[PDB]
Amino acid sequence: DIGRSSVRPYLEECTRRFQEMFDRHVVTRPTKVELTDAELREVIDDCNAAVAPLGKTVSDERWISYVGVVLWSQSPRHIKDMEAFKAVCVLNCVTFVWDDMDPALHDFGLFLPQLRKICEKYYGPEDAEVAYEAARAFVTSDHMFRDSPIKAALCTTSPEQYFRFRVTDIGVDFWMKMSYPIYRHPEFTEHAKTSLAARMTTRGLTIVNDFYSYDREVSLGQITNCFRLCDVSDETAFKEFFQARLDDMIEDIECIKAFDQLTQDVFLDLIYGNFVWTTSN
Amino acid sequence: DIGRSSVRPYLEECTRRFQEMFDRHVVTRPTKVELTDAELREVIDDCNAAVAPLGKTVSDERWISYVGVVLWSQSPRHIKDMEAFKAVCVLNCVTFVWDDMDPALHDFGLFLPQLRKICEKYYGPEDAEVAYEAARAFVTSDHMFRDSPIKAALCTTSPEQYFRFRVTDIGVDFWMKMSYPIYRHPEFTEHAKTSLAARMTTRGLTIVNDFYSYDREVSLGQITNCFRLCDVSDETAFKEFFQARLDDMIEDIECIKAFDQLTQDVFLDLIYGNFVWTTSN
């Protein structure tokens, strides 16, 4: 009865264990990026304009809720380009809206030009092409894998196949390829473009997201959640699985520390900031 | 020490077991692409032109040896664009030369424009940008990771970290991104562009290449080889590791079969074709 299953009995304990892991392995607290009133207004206006052709209406409160992940998960101390930062705010929010839509209502002809428009506004010509390609590939993947036997096979076989799918599907490759111009750091730029950046950070983002979304997703019949690979109703089976996932996170974080200082800060702020945002309110 | 270690005692047995696995799981044997005399000449002249600014002279025999992997590992039944095919022949060969060079002699200023020239000659405008970016990212990764603590961390920690590095470093992401125009198949094009194609095929290509290159690489102090993660001098430890690598290959191939017919043909032709080429006289 997977649709009725729940990780609620482990909610507090898992939250505590995630935080303890971060404190032991990352140490540095993530800090939230503040936008001026004018910056937030510009982001919201661009969000509304991108989504208007689809006849979609979204409240300011919803935009602000969606943009939180960007505010908490970027790396404030390393920011050099706030135009690129605003682009990521806009692109994150509007693609989140796209992902939330009935796939029948997905109109690539109307939406793709809006993504292009955003990228051309905020990025230089080279970066605009990279960010747009990543956005395009992301939304196209989102569309392709609805009701796909490939999605079923990748998500039900093993944690290995599942995270391999989530590199794209959770949006982290897209995130890196739109976020590197924020930092203008040659090493990070290359790790983003090669997708090694996304590969290093996929598990830490996905494990946290999946834990806190499990109950809702399972009730909606969504299969893209690693905790569906264990019997959550069996306390000992869940605990062994959860520990294996913590072990995955730790191994990633410890390898992340081999990267240069700025790059590792960006990677760790992303994984840890995502956890803070997911868990807030 | 590891420098004097060898997988030579397992050479025959592992070759038979790789083949047995392919016979059980893939069945359809790969067939070689035959180039006309004029096609091969054009490819070789393009290789020579690209590499001439780097001071390198390479014989036809050497080029033909480098191009074999392309002839064996593409999917001849599905070829629609031979211009794109020739481009892959050229780009594969010239980037192998780059990889083979002393990194002090790398000259991005001289080499990158040659890579661009090749892409502009053989591909349409959009495809040329995608193929070029993948080539640029590949050769840049090659240069960046030469004496890198990141490479050391990823190659020595676990099979998971190692294969994550090889998605780029073995050149398969680059391969997929320059190869999709050969096939003109929208689903395959997307799997190439998201890198899911590379992620699905990395282990099958890397495990085979690593086994057959182990003795040479280890005597040269090169660390990019998954068999350095086990004690190859210990028969039972080697066999446990080798079986785990076969199981990785099998799981991938069985998941590859969930993709559409053409896509799976291309993926399996690549993995199996590479094995046939590697093992060839």
Swiss-Prot record, chains A, B:
Kindly list the GO molecular function terms attached to this UniProt entry: isomerase activity; lyase activity; metal ion binding
Q: What is its EC number?
A: 4.2.3.146
Effect listed in the UniProt record for changing D99E: No change in product (cyclooctat-9-en-7-ol)
> Can you tell which superkingdom this protein's organism belongs to?
Bacteria
Motif (DDXXD motif) on chain: 99-102
Matching entries from Pfam families are given as: Terpene_syn_C_2
Query: Known consequence of changing W277G?
Result: Produces 3,7,18-dolabellatriene
Q: How is the cofactor bound?
A: Binds 3 Mg(2+) ions per subunit.
Q: Which reaction does it catalyse?
A: geranylgeranyl diphosphate + H2O = cyclooctat-9-en-7-ol + diphosphate
The record, for InterPro entries, names: Isoprenoid_synthase_dom_sf
Q: Which residues participate in Mg(2+) 1 binding?
A: D99
The answer to whether keyword Magnesium applies is yes
Query: Which of this chain's residues are annotated to bind Mg(2+) 2?
Result: D99
Q: Which cofactor does it need?
A: Mg(2+)
Which miscellaneous remark does the UniProt record hold? 3,7,18-dolabellatriene produced by the Trp288Gly mutant has potential antibiotic activity against multidrug-resistant S.aureus (MRSA).
Q: Which family does it belong to?
A: Belongs to the terpene synthase family.
Q: How does it assemble?
A: Homodimer.
Q: What is the protein name stated in its UniProt record?
A: Cyclooctat-9-en-7-ol synthase
> What organism is this sequence from?
Streptomyces melanosporofaciens
